[PDB]
Structure 1
Amino acid sequence: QVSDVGTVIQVGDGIARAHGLDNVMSGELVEFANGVMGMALNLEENNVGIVILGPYTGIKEGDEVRRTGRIMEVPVGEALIGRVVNPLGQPVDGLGPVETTETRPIESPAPGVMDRRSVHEPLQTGIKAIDALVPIGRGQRELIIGDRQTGKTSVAIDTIINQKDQNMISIYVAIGQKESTVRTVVETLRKHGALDYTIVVTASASQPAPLLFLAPYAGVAMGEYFMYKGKHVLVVYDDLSKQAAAYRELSLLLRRPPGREAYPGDIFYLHSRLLERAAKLSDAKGGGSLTALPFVETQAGDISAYIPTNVISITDGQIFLQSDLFFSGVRPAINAGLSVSRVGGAAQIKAMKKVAGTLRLDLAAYRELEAFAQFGSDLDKATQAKLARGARTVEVLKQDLHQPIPVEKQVLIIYALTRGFLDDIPVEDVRRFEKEFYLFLDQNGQHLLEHIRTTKDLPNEDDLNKAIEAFKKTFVVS
């Protein structure tokens, strides 16, 4: 046997300082002669600043560490489907330990620039507002930010659940999420039946800051193996604010110099590695695809903070949620004004590109004119028709919880004339109008939406104008 054995000197705050290790290689895994793991990060001149992975109560001074030379790896494989695992791989719900032996390095090079493609495959989110106004491709990096309990986790749940009829694998990484809430989310996922493809990785608050830091990297590393296989993978984060907080705490413990607001310097070089390992791979490396939805918290939508400023410049699109609108009755509180998408158009089907190209303009015009008319006295009545139409089309862009609406049923409702038909009692009709319309189509005019499913484009509008007329006649006025 050959090895290089160290000596632990200082222990505290989940940090261990080791001396010796003439053959120490940076970033390797090391054990502390107590069955616990550890990582080496700050290879100072005459000592190694080791970072403790897990409980550190049993470690004292004088313990000797054993080198392993193993770059920090995580097991991957097909048996992970339906499993909830610690970032090291061990499951938390019993069920026996992990089975697949294939492993990958947590820190791995990102796919090359020459190996990517113009992302031209839509994603069927199923939520009306995000579907119509802020599209998502199959390799895009959409960002979701907002205040507490504005529905970000609900958006993630709806997005993961709606993948019931596609070739997608969804990976959940709950950083800093409370364990009871993670259990509730797992129960909801099992109750809706999405465990047939979901890989969920959790890291409780009680877990050490090193694990809270390494969890998203473990999730993306697990995703990459399925990526190179040729599949499509969806990865959803939680509380990258808490991830950054954990890394800041670790850096302050290792006595690194602090930058602005105590965050260390390499935060951006960290987030770039975390995020830019998702893209679309051409045939040269396999026709894979992977998209991510990192989450960020904020106070009242205040984007002046350092972490949101570092994050928004990376993601290809930003989705804003505001409690101000959310309490106002827009339950999916997508603020359509400040939400952008750098893949707009190419991520929408040949029907949505036709129908929704004017809805965003109409909503922006409605808000533009109602800003002038925040008070409704002695207004110029000539422009009031567009205000009315915007008010009665914004009502359409909302749906209840656990309600994934298919794109085929959505496109008829958001048709460029369906924004401008009768609307006889639009203040209260439209809500039941859309449900009775979906039932009407599914019981009478299923062929109409069958054409949309088969073609990804509008049929002749008269062929559906007849259906619209028949549904208006049959449906009872309000």
Structure 2
Amino acid sequence: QVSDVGTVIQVGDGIARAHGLDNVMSGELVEFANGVMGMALNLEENNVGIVILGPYTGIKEGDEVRRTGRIMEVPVGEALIGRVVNPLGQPVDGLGPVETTETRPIESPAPGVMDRRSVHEPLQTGIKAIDALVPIGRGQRELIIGDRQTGKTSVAIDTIINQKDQNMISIYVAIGQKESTVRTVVETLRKHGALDYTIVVTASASQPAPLLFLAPYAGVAMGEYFMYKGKHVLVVYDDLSKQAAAYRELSLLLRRPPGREAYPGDIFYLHSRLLERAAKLSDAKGGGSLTALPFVETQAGDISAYIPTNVISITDGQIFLQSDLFFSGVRPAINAGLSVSRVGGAAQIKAMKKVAGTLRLDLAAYRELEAFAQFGSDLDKATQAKLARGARTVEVLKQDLHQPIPVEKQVLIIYALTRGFLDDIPVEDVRRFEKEFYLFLDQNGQHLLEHIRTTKDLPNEDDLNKAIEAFKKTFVVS
């Protein structure tokens, strides 16, 4: 009997080779004697190559391998919300089993050209430095790239928390993170109330390479259920770089020839297949959407590296966080020159699109002129621009941790910045100016905020100027 039963020939480093399995199909799940599950990749003439999805210590030569008849699948359903699971869907938080009754394939085709729609719905993250000059829309994919200890996880968690009052499911996938770090992230989500609509998929650094390679696909497959039911999903991949490292480990264990930086040839395909599946579906397909926020960690801020370039070449824009700016007090550390959003304009409300259109280019020019100005003198217009605008934009784009700011207040603050109302105050006074301006707005100008909330447009021609002048009349300077 070699039709649905096999025998192990070799075991080592998380991969196995089995004899028999005549009728096994490529990509099928297989089960060892211990109950550990496996994946069939290579159907050679005389043997089948199997990747072990779990602890391979208990597997020995001569053990029996039997078919399951199903292509690689994960359990999906509504009951998975609020739980912490592994890439295989097994519960990990210890709160009992999971009552899902449906499965989806890990490898699924992406929506076609005619199944998509242009992105037109803003995704307010609550951060000025994102919502102003790097807008994110529903169905877009936008990676956060930077060095270690720069705030990428903080940005992701704040974005997840900000979606409390909207009907959208959030998925957080941790690839290669410390178990304690994942525990603390889950605790913060529980404290802020995000666990009512969040699914956490974890694969720590102690797990074998196959699970690290498989986890993001499990997360996206989980999101596909809600996307095709007509709902909106946000998915976060925590280290696509660690996924690439695990895939390189697996490929070199399979003795595939290495390319640039010892990565396999299909390293670009690995990421493109995953990231291409997030899309904004059309009305015929139900109008659902899936938003992806992949993460890439650079070395010494080198954006020219192979993996960063590969991931940038796939997504719809990047948010570059700089360590040199993270230090010295610019905590958001947004680098306007290297950042870009390719769905800009359409991913913003009409007011914000009207106000903050040119900010990214303005700060890029300001950084260039600041770099150049170290050598010599400046013209009158250069001195006006560099200091009255760039220095104040850099200061007003700064934001504190866990401080969501409504878009109706953001449009006000960038309008005041752009119209030149901040030129007469010192640079150090702008944060107190912003705080007192928000207080004054809440106290007196609630009707402008209501008009912006209801119409998504600017409130008035001259009443806005009048209100800003009224606030400036009572603001104490220095």
Shorter-chain TM range is over 0.9
SS class of match (1:103): strand
Aligned residues: 478
TM-superposition CA deviations, 1:48-67 (whole Å, max 9, x none): 11111111111111111111
Q: Distance in 2 between matches of 1:85 and 1:160?
A: 18
1:370–1:387 contact (8 Å) kept in structure 2:
no
* Aligned residue in 2 for 1:357: 357
Whole-angstrom CA distance in 1 between matches of 2:417 and 2:36: 64
Secondary structure of 2:284's aligned partner: helix
Q: Is the 8 A contact 1:230 1:287 kept in 2?
A: yes
Distance 1:438 1:376 in 2: 39
Tell me by how many angstroms 1:3 deviates.
5.4
Structure 2: distance between partners of 1:317 and 1:414: 22
Note the alpha carbon deviations across 1:139-193, whole angstroms, 9 max, x for none: 1111211111111111111111111222211111100011000001111111111
2:389 & 2:281 partners in 1: Cα distance? 43
CA deviations over 1:91-146 (Å, ceiling 9, x no partner): 11111111121111011111111011111111111110111111111111112111
Give the distance between the partners of 2:463 and 2:48, measured in 1 at CA: 74
Partner of 1:45: 45
Deviation at 1:475, TM superposition (A): 2.7
**SS of alignment partner, residue 65 of structure 1:** strand
Output the CA distance in 2 between the equivalents of 1:361 and 1:250: 43
Deviations 1:425-477 (A, max 9, x none): 33222111111211221122212101110010001132222221222223332
Alpha-carbon deviation of 1:238?
Answer: 0.9
Are the equivalent residues in 2 in contact too, given 1:369–1:387 (CA < 8 A)?
no
State the alpha-carbon separation in 2 of the partners of residues 441 and 125 from structure 1. Answer: 21
SS of the aligned residue for 1:303 comes to: coil
Q: Over residues 176-224 of structure 1, what are the superposed CA-to-partner deviations in whole Å (9 max), with x where a residue is unaligned?
A: 0110000011111111111111111111111111111100000000000
SS of 2:8's equivalent in the other structure is: strand
| DSSP 3-state at the match of 1:461 | coil
Structure 1 residue 258, shift from structure 2 partner: 2.2
Deviates more, 1:166-175 or 1:459-468: 459-468
User: 1:21 Cα shift?
Assistant: 1.3
Residues 382 and 312 (structure 1), Cα distance of their counterparts in 2 relative to 1, 3 Å cut: closer
Retained in 2: the 8 A contact 1:75–1:89? yes
1:423 deviation in Å? 4.2
For residue 137 of structure 1, give the secondary structure of its aligned residue in structure 2: coil
Measured in 2, the distance between the counterparts of 1:41 and 1:133 equals 44
Residues 378 and 169 (structure 1 numbering): CA distance in 2 closer, same or farther, change over 3 Å?
closer
Asked if the contact 2:173/2:201 (under 8 Å) is kept, the reply is yes
> Does the Cα contact within 8 Å between 1:143 and 1:315 map onto a contact in 2?
yes
CA contact (8 A) 1:27 1:72 kept: yes
Does 246-255 or 383-392 show the bigger shift? 383-392
Q: Percent identity?
A: 100
Instruction: Tell me whether 1:277 sits opposite 2:294 in the alignment.
Output: no
- Which runs of 5 or more residues in structure 2 are unaligned? none
Distance in 2, matches of 1:203 and 1:368, equals: 42
* Alpha-carbon shift at residue 2 of structure 1 (Å): 10
Matched-pair contact (CA < 8 Å) for 2:201–2:219: yes
* Alignment partners' CA distance in 2, 1:380 and 1:410: 30
Helix, strand or coil at the partner of 2:96? coil
CA separation of 1:107 and 1:320: change in aligned 2, threshold 3 A: same
1:360 Cα deviation (Å)?
2.8
SS in 2 for 1:291: strand
Contact 2:142 2:292 in 1 (8 A): yes
* Residue aligned with 1:29, SS: strand
Secondary structure class of the residue paired with 2:82: coil
Structure 1 residue 378, shift from structure 2 partner? 7.1
Superposition pairs of residues 229-248 of structure 1, within 5 angstroms: 229-248=229-248
The change in CA–CA distance for 1:464 and 1:378 in structure 2 (over 3 A counts) is: closer
**CA distance, structure 1, for counterparts of residue 378 and residue 398 of structure 2:** 31
Greater Cα offset, 297-306 or 362-371: 362-371
Contact 1:412–1:418 under 8 Å retained in 2: no
The answer to whether the 8 Å contact 2:8/2:16 transfers is: yes
Specify whether residues 442 and 2 from structure 1 end up closer, same or farther in structure 2 by C-alpha distance, changes over 3 A only.
farther
Q: CA deviation at 1:371?
A: 2.1
Determine if contact 2:175/2:237 at 8 Å carries over to the other structure: yes
CA contact (8 A) 2:54 2:208 kept: yes
Residues 347-396 of structure 1: per-residue CA shift (max 9 Å, x gap):
11110111112333432332232122125767667644443322122210
In structure 1, how many angstroms separate the alpha carbons of the residues matched to 2:115 and 2:352? 29
User: What CA distance in whole angstroms lies between the structure 1 residues aligned with 2:455 and 2:381?
Assistant: 42
| CA apart distance, 1:417 | 5.6
* Stretch deviating more after TM superposition (311-320 or 422-431): 422-431
The 2-side partners of 1:58 and 1:158 are apart by 42
Instruction: Indicate if the aligned counterparts of 1:11 and 1:60 stay in contact, CA closer than 8 A.
Output: yes
Instruction: Indicate the larger mover: 243-252 or 366-375.
Output: 366-375
Counterpart position of 2:151: 151
C-alpha contact 2:392 2:422 (8 A) present in aligned 1 = no
Residue aligned with 1:163, SS: coil
8 A Cα contact 2:3 2:20, kept in partner: no
Aligned counterparts of 1:164 and 1:472: Cα–Cα separation in 2? 34
| Partner Cα separation in structure 2 for residue 467 and residue 174 of structure 1 | 46
Q: Is the 8 A contact 1:373 1:379 kept in 2?
A: no
- Give the Å deviation of 1:419: 4.8
The 8 Å contact of residues 359 and 416 in structure 1, kept in 2 or not, is answered as no
The answer on whether the counterparts of 2:125 and 2:159 sit within 8 Å (CA) in structure 1 is: yes
Q: Is the 8 A contact 2:123 2:347 kept in 1?
A: yes
Q: Aligned equivalents of 1:266 and 1:36: distance in 2?
A: 27
1:263 CA displacement: 1.4
> With structure 1 as the length reference, what TM-score do the two structures score?
0.96
Structure 1 residues 382, 401: closer, same or farther in 2, change over 3 A?
closer
Of stretches 363-372 and 236-245 in structure 1, the one that deviates more from structure 2 is: 363-372
- Quick one: distance in 1 between partners of 2:241 and 2:295? 8
Residues 142 and 293 in structure 1, CA contact (< 8 A), matched pair in contact too: yes
**Cα–Cα, structure 1 residues 385 and 250, in superposed 2: closer, same or farther, change >3 Å?**
closer
Q: Confirm or deny: 8 A CA contact 2:85 2:91 kept in the other structure.
A: yes
Q: Is the 8 A contact 2:119 2:137 kept in 1?
A: yes
- How do 1:370-409 and structure 2 match up within 5 A? 370-375=370-375, 383-409=383-409
1:35, distance to aligned residue in structure 2 (A) = 1.2
- Structure 2 Cα separation of the partners of residues 378 and 318 of structure 1: 33
CA deviations 1:27-77 (Å, max 9, x no partner) are 111111111111111222211111111111111111111111211111111
Q: Is the 8 A contact 2:29 2:38 kept in 1?
A: yes
- Indicate the larger mover: 212-221 or 136-145: 136-145
Query: Are residues 381 and 447 of structure 1, via their aligned partners in 2, closer, same or farther at CA, if it must alter by over 3 Å?
Result: closer
Write the distance in 2 (CA, Å) between the matches of 1:285 and 1:66: 38
Distance 1:28 1:384, change over 3 A: same
Query: Helix, strand or coil: the match of 1:413?
Result: helix
